[PDB]
């Protein structure tokens, strides 16, 4: 889940290469989106609609073995100074849009990074993250500028536990080139396959090698039941100073008016030149 | 070019007496813009506008930017944050680099689709292509100056491709990087190129280009 | 505006027009009509639009360079997107460098190849407009490919 | 709205506003009528 | 944005009004 | 990184400028 990211890599979800740690265990690579405004004035609640779109009807192997519904989580790494708007700052419309989603900081003193999830995917195909932009005026550390907003949004179960074992939602592969001497269910979906190295698989994926065909090391013994996947989407949000745009609008209106006066001075010189040519 | 009031003023008569500045006026006034010229013939000149902004704001950023591997990123974030209007100067510089290259591409489309390059103006087009190469070199050398992840790795990639040549390519890579590996020598050399070598190369190429367009004039009607 | 008429009686202007030059001798006055008044309209347009793009979309301070960690997606500037795609998709590095160098030298050869025909109008240059529009679509397609993953770069994921 | 969308919308607005630029200048020329 | 198209229309309209106010005004006082 | 706004300006201006240079060319090529 997202809290095993807190455990595995407490310092930060993002590595130096920019690969969120979610990928270390969620091996598949589905899409992910963030609808964050191109710019947000300071000290203003806005919304970051994190789309985690997976096929609704697709079913994934639950840990027990029986298929079920996927869930959706995410690690929205906002810029420095940003946070999740407190409920009082939320508007009633955004009180409704956000609902009862619980947002937690990846760690204390790191409120910018927020880890939602796990949430039932049926009704969280889009998770509205209510952000609150910082005020550079109040906080000297914060400045106005374009800042990167990295999202890691994941649906479905992982493939590797923090213990390093492999989950049932994973295409198992051959440890050694050993013929499959025995394959048995014992009223379960697990299969103790058989160098004839005896290996066990859980009750997740259906075998693609059920026959007594010889096996070689590396070759996938089972199908890949992973219908979900982790995705990451890096965007940008400009913390814009309103005064910058006031003076920009004033400067560009000055330029527009000066261009008008340039065309009118050309009209005047054209009149003078036309009278000069006339004799 | 000089109105009657300026022509009769004793100051202008002083300059005319010594450097005969009136000849400049006659040469500037003798020219005419043919009817076929349209708004798209502005694109070349706007390519120069974006360069002159890039010349000015680059001069601005040389006063604060420190081309060192320990201080280049800190000095770029100092320009942005601490320096007065350094956010504006750096953002204008990035934007005028992109807009210089875009205005240049649009200018090559104008020229090509107006037959500007055709005989007798083959050399204006060739100096054009050289200018274009010089501008993309300005873009590449600049991309790496912040010594951020994007810049450092872009210089890593681009500077190592000369290695493709079996023997000579290794020497070209050691020359581009100024060392066996992208490091402080690569940043000192890319900065010397960006802020010194390439402004002089593009200014000599701009003077050649504009002298050939002045001599030959504009292309004919389509 | 007053428009000078080409004084074709002048043998010097006719000789210049024969060589393709001498189009700066007729039409509207260059100064002050166009140079003094109209050029600053474009200089102020560009200065205001670059300042507005800078203010609205300021430059982004990236991360400090890590020599040990390569960004998942490293990209050059947009103008080197077709140049960069060529590199990645072409297997042999040396053909990639040959293509990168063939862009500017082929451009330098455009005038000599095309000057066989004297007609400047695109509609009187069928083969040159075919090669140009095909090459513009190919450079825009390569540039768009650079952004995509290497698997979906050549098709833009479309098919 | 979002920065990403300014790839598509920003391109069409450009196409839209270049011609609206062009056209409006002609409108001024026609309107001045001198 | 629809608000953006409204503000754009207003911007252009006012600037046309000032350009043509100035044009016909200066032509009237004969400055053009 | 990809700058979406800048590539919007680029993909907007390139085809409108090409269309406008082909229109100016057609109109010069026309015979009244």
């Amino acid at each position: 889940y997202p809290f095993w990211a807190q455990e595995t890599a407490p310092l930060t979800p993002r590595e130096a290469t920019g690969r969120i740690v979610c990928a270390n265990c969620h091996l598949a690579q589905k899409a992910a989106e963030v609808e964050i405004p191109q710019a947000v004035l300071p000290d203003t609640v806005f919304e970051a609609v994190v789309k985690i779109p997976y096929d609704l009807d697709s079913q994934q192997v639950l840990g027990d073995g029986s298929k079920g519904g996927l869930n959706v989580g995410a690690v929205l790494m906002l810029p420095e100074g940003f946070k999740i708007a407190p409920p009082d700052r939320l508007s009633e419309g955004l009180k409704e849009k956000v609902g009862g989603t619980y947002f937690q900081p990846y760690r204390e003193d790191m409120e910018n990074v927020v880890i939602v999830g796990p949430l039932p995917g049926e009704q969280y195909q889009e998770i509205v993250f209510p952000v609150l932009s910082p005020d550079p005026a109040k906080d000297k550390s914060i400045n106005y500028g374009k800042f990167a907003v990295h999202l890691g949004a994941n649906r479905g179960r992982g493939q590797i536990y923090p213990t390093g074992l492999l989950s049932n939602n994973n295409a198992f592969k051959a440890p050694n080139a050993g013929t499959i001497s025995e394959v048995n269910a014992l009223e379960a979906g697990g299969y103790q396959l058989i160098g004839t190295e005896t290996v066990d698989i859980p009750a997740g994926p259906e075998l693609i090698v059920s026959a007594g065909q010889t096996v070689e090391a590396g070759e996938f013994l089972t199908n890949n039941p992973n219908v979900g996947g982790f995705g990451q989407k890096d965007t940008e949000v400009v913390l814009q100073n309103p005064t910058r745009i006031k003076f920009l609008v004033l400067f560009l209106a000055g330029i527009m008016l000066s261009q008008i006066l340039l065309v009118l001075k050309k009209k005047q010189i054209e009149k003078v030149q036309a009278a000069e040519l006339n004799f | 070019m000089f109105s009657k009031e300026v022509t009769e003023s004793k100051v202008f008569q002083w300059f005319n007496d010594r450097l005969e500045v009136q000849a400049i006026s006659d040469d500037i006034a003798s020219k005419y813009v043919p009817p076929h010229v349209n708004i798209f013939y502005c694109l070349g000149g706007l390519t120069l506008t974006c360069f002159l902004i890039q010349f000015a704001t680059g001069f601005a950023m040389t006063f604060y930017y420190k081309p060192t591997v320990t201080e280049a990123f800190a000095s770029v974030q100092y320009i942005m944050n601490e320096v007065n209007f350094g956010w504006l100067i750096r953002s204008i510089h990035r934007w005028s680099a992109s807009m210089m290259v875009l205005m240049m591409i649009l200018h090559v489309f104008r020229v090509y689709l107006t037959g500007g390059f055709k005989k007798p103006r083959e050399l204006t087009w060739v100096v054009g292509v050289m200018l274009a190469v010089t501008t993309v070199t300005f873009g590449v050398t600049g991309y790496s100056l912040p010594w951020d992840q994007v810049g450092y790795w872009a210089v890593k990639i681009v500077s190592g491709v000369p290695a493709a040549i079996p023997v000579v390519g290794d020497q070209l890579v050691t020359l581009m990087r100024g060392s066996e590996s992208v490091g402080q020598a690569t940043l000192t050399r890319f900065y010397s190129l960006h802020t010194f070598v390439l402004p002089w190369a593009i200014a000599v190429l701009l003077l050649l280009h504009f002298l050939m367009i002045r001599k030959q004039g504009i292309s004919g009607p389509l | 505006s007053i428009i000078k008429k080409p004084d074709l009686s002048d043998p010097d202007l006719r000789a210049k027009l024969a060589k393709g030059m001498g189009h700066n001798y007729y039409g509207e006055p260059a100064w002050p009509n166009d140079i003094l008044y109209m050029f600053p309209i474009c200089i102020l347009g560009a200065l205001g639009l670059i300042a507005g793009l800078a203010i609205l979309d300021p430059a982004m301070i990236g991360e400090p360079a890590d020599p040990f960690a390569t960004p998942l997606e490293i990209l050059p500037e947009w103008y080197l997107y077709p140049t960069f795609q060529i590199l990645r998709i072409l297997p042999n590095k040396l053909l990639g460098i040959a293509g990168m160098a063939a862009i500017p030298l082929g451009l330098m050869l455009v005038p000599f190849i095309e000057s066989v025909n004297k007609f400047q109008n695109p509609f009187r240059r069928p083969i040159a407009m075919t090669v140009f529009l095909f090459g513009t679509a190919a450079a825009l397609w390569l540039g768009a490919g650079a952004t995509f993953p290497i698997d979906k770069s050549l098709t833009l994921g479309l098919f | 709205m979002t920065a990403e969308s300014m790839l598509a919308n920003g391109a069409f607005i450009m196409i839209g506003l270049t011609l609206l630029g062009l056209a409006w200048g002609f409108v001024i020329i026609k309107l001045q009528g001198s | 944005m629809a608000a953006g198209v409204g503000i754009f229309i207003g911007y252009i309209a006012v600037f046309t009004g000032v350009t043509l106010g100035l044009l016909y005004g200066l032509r009237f006082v004969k400055l053009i | 990184m990809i700058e979406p706004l800048l590539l919007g300006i680029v993909l907007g201006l390139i085809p409108v400028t090409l269309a406008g240079l082909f229109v100016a060319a057609y109109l010069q090529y026309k015979r009244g």
Binding site: - | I39 | - | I13, G21, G25 | - | -
Partner: peptide, 29 residues
């Protein structure tokens, strides 16, 4: 009125207006 909208519309309007002032001054395109 959103100041972000007004900034984007000011830049868009200055692009439109510079094109219109160049075709107005030059009397054509």
């Amino acid at each position: 009125m959103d100041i972000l909208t007004l900034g984007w519309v000011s830049v868009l309007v200055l692009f439109t207006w510079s094109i219109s002032m160049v075709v107005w001054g030059r009397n054509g395109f």
